[PDB]
A paper describes a structure:
Eight dog (Canis familiaris) allergens are included in the World Health Organization and International Union of Immunological Societies Allergen Nomenclature database, among which Can f 1 is a major allergen (Pomés et al., 2018; Schou et al., 1991). Like most mammalian respiratory allergens, Can f 1 belongs to the lipocalin protein family (Flower, 1996; Virtanen et al., 2012). Lipocalins share low sequence identity but have conserved structural motifs, characterized by an N‐terminal 310 helix, a C‐terminal α helix, and a central calyx formed by two antiparallel β‐sheets that enclose a central hydrophobic cavity forming a β‐barrel for ligand binding (Dartt, 2011). In summary, the structures of Can f 1‐hIgE Fab complexes revealed two unique and partially overlapping epitopes on Can f 1.
Results of MD simulations performed for Can f 1 indicate that the conformation of the N‐terminus region of the protein is very fluid and it oscillates between the predominant helical and a less abundant extended conformation. The N‐terminus of Can f 1 is at the entrance of the β‐barrel and may play a role in opening the access to the ligand binding cavity. This is supported by the results of our MD simulations, as well as crystal structure analysis of bound and free forms of Can f 1. However, none of the Can f 1 structures (conformationally different) including nCan f 1, showed the presence of ligands (fatty acids) in their cavity, and the physiological ligand of Can f 1 is still unknown.
Residue numbers in the entry:
A (entry chain C): 29 to 171
B (entry chain B), C (entry chain A): 29 to 174
The structure:
């Protein structure tokens, strides 16, 4: 598993308004599990509160394709042309609503203009035309 | 050395009041060199601008004892009782002035109450009896408009 | 000519403490003149005041070597190994003092870590071991109370 380890969630976009937008994010850890599954852990600062999220990504028979939220969501993990970056694209149900999302992951926290421009091209091609939000980063989350 | 690698500068105090009042700091990198020397690199955000500092720490014959600034300053690298923390203590010339400083380093950015309480005792004992500054942390420093 | 046009002064270092350190800078314009000379125009914000500088760089017979400040300074202009960046290194008199400086120029205002790391190697090799200041960028400069 190459996608294993420490990642920075640097940018996100979607097909719908996301009012669930964080104020800061901790690094994302993807832990490789039995049977090719991935456990994603991240902490988000939303409304003064540090919310710790854990999402298990269930491996399918298609490489790079995962399910989550008990099948209500399909997540595609694709490499960026730009080094040290990966793109998540997801479809299906989140919090009752049905939303398509893209997330830009990087090994490094440093902003990459090149990775962002590529993330824009990818996203707008998939018909995600909302704003691209580049997320504030913090190694820890403080109320 | 054990001290090699990535550190968070989590707290600092001094004998004077330092004009170096950062708004955030990047991690401190101590890079091992030929002959047991250390290159200390850190970046500080001050008023929209990034101060990229590099200090070569010249190994002496005394473990934990280093010089810097052409012998004009002495730096003691001392382990904390508390796990994954170190204390830097320094005496001599910095930017022309005489100043003594203590800095608390940790492998993790999470503040440790135990490490901080010990760093307070260390500081008060050494006559670095000003306020202890806990620094804002950022993995990067970017100037305004860059 | 290669150096002509719009630059961002992104980083600066020196061999002496520069107390006259800028808080913000406008872009540097290098205009090519008759006979291979260069007119450098920049505005710097220093303690609420705008320094509108025009420096004529007088071409010599040595490629990349210029004099300026009515002969009080010699300026070496080299490309950076890193793309879309240039390095100025200068020796001589500034504000009634002897001081050696390096300046990192870029076509883009966005930080390049590669250009900065290279600028450090270049500077430390010329014995400029002070902090590398990465400058805040502004299209305009306005004095306090204007």
């Amino acid at each position: 598993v190459a996608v294993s380890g420490k990642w920075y969630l640097k940018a996100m976009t979607a097909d719908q308004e996301v009012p669930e937008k964080p104020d800061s994010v901790t690094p994302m850890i993807l832990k490789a599990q039995k049977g090719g599954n991935l456990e994603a852990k991240i902490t988000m600062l939303t409304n003064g509160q540090c919310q710790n999220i854990t999402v298990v990504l269930h491996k399918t028979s298609e490489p790079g394709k995962y399910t989550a939220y008990e099948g209500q969501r399909v997540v595609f993990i694709q490499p960026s042309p730009v080094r040290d970056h990966y793109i998540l694209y997801s479809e299906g149900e989140l919090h009752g609503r049905q939303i398509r999302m893209a997330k830009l992951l990087g090994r490094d926290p440093e902003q990459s203009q090149e990775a962002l421009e590529d993330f824009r091209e990818f996203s707008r091609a998939k018909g995600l035309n909302q704003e691209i939000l580049e997320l504030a980063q913090s190694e820890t989350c403080s109320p």
